[PDB]
Amino acid sequence: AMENFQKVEKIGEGTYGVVYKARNKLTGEVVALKKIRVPSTAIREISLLKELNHPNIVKLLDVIHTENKLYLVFEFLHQDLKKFMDASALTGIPLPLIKSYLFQLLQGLAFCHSHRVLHRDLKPQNLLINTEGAIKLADFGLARAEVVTLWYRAPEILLGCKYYSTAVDIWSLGCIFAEMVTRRALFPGDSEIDQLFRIFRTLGTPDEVVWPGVTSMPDYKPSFPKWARQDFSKVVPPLDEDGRSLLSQMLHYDPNKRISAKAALAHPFFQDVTKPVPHLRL
């Protein structure tokens, strides 16, 4: 099984696996090999993911289930968005590239969501880029299948909703959009309550007016402090009014009011979208 792969170097770790750059000794392919750690339900879900192919989803090439361990073989990309943001931080990512990346990831999400597949853990480290200007979603579907970052968590998850929706991915992508534009994380919480209260300090403590049902959510407390909302003009300067209007719709508290990926693709912010090429030093 694995004897067919030659490890080159380590490129990631999760709470349950390690990812190596590796070479397929068979095909000559260079790949990302994720070594996990097997429940049959996980096998069938992962198998369904192999069919979920889109230009903005990192391709799952092979699933090897062997010596009762699990290897996932992915398309290799040379950089993630976290590294590209850090590399770009003196100057910032140019707006047309931010806009191209947001549009592409919304295409990725629209495709996944149309097949009822949620990502659930979008973050810059899971967004992979190449020299041609493409950006792709990684780790897609693997959640339903080493401190965990909370920064991009939708508030319905933080408030204990078990049966949340595709809207959680739009919230995460909105947080990443804001971070591209300002070169700072939007809500960098370091615990669940710190995350929730950073959201409330910026967008206002949610109530029944803006989010019907919120006061009955599992981890909602009447004792939450009540902060007023701030203007987006203060939150993501100097993003223009189209970009701010789109971000506001992606960060609506009520997941049912939050914009869908498909609707976001029609937003006027993308009327002049283009596909620039990044400066990548590899």
Ligand SMILES: Cn1nccc1Nc1nccc(-c2ccn([C@H](CO)c3ccc(Cl)c(F)c3)c(=O)c2)n1
């Ligand atoms: C060279 N380089 N630098 C950064 C990324 C890459 N290239 C690359 N190419 C294809 C896939 C991946 C890739 C990376 C990280 N992860 C996550 C990061 O959150 C990850 C989740 C779960 C566990 Cl268990 C893990 F170890 C790593 C991927 O899923 C998949 N990376």
